[PDB]
């Protein structure tokens, strides 16, 4: 049950997610999952990143959900639950800016 997850921030805007993530104390991969502002039934994975080029910054990835049950960022890599998706991206960076490391404070 996604709403019970401490990383699920629910109905917060993109700007608020950036306010929370743009904190000097957050290491790369600090994240949160929220609802998409404009896509009904889709969620967003907001992730903090850091490089010497851009410094501290935030990326937003859309998580699609199938009525057939799967969750995914890219259709080639699907999961049975949002929880499994988070667990997989905590170990593989794949196309994300960084692997998921710590839940946003
Ligand atoms: O869906 C949106 O409106 C939105 C957002 O809420 O920032 C978004 C846009 C691109 C990727 C993830 C999320």
- Residue whose token pair is 């996604």: 2
81: Cα separation from own chain's centroid = 14
What CA–CA distance (Å, rounded) separates 26 from 56?
9
CA atoms within 13 A on the CB side of 27: 5
Question: Pocket around ligand 1: residues whose beta carbon is below 6 Å from it?
Answer: 14, 36-39, 44, 60-62
Technique behind this structure?
X-ray
Q: Do 66 and 43 form a contact (C-beta atoms < 8 A)?
A: no
Cα(39) to centroid(ligand 1), Å? 8
- Nearest of 47, 50, 53 to residue 18 by alpha carbon: 47
Domain limits of the chain? 1-105
Query: What resolution (Å)?
Result: 1.9
Homologous superfamily of 1-105: SH2 domain (3.30.505.10)
The token pair at 19 is 């306010």
3-state secondary structure string across 6-71? CCEEECCCHHHHHHHHCCCCCCCCCEEEEECCCCCCCEEEEEEEEECCCEEEEEEEEEEECCCCCE
Q: Do 59 and 49 form a contact (C-beta atoms < 8 A)?
A: yes
What CA–CA distance (Å, rounded) separates 1 from 57?
29
Q: Whose CA is nearest to atom 4 of ligand 1?
A: 36
């Amino acid at each position: 049950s996604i709403q019970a997850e401490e990383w699920y921030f629910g109905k917060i805007t993109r700007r608020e997610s950036e306010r929370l993530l743009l904190n000097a104390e957050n290491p790369r991969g600090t994240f949160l999952v929220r609802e998409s502002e404009t896509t009904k039934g889709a969620y967003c994975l907001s992730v903090s990143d850091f490089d010497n080029a851009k410094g501290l910054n935030v990326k937003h990835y859309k998580i699609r959900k199938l009525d057939s049950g799967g969750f995914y960022i890219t259709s080639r890599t699907q999961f049975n639950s949002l929880q499994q998706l988070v667990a997989y991206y905590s170990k593989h960076a794949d196309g994300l800016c960084h692997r998921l490391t710590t839940v946003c404070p």
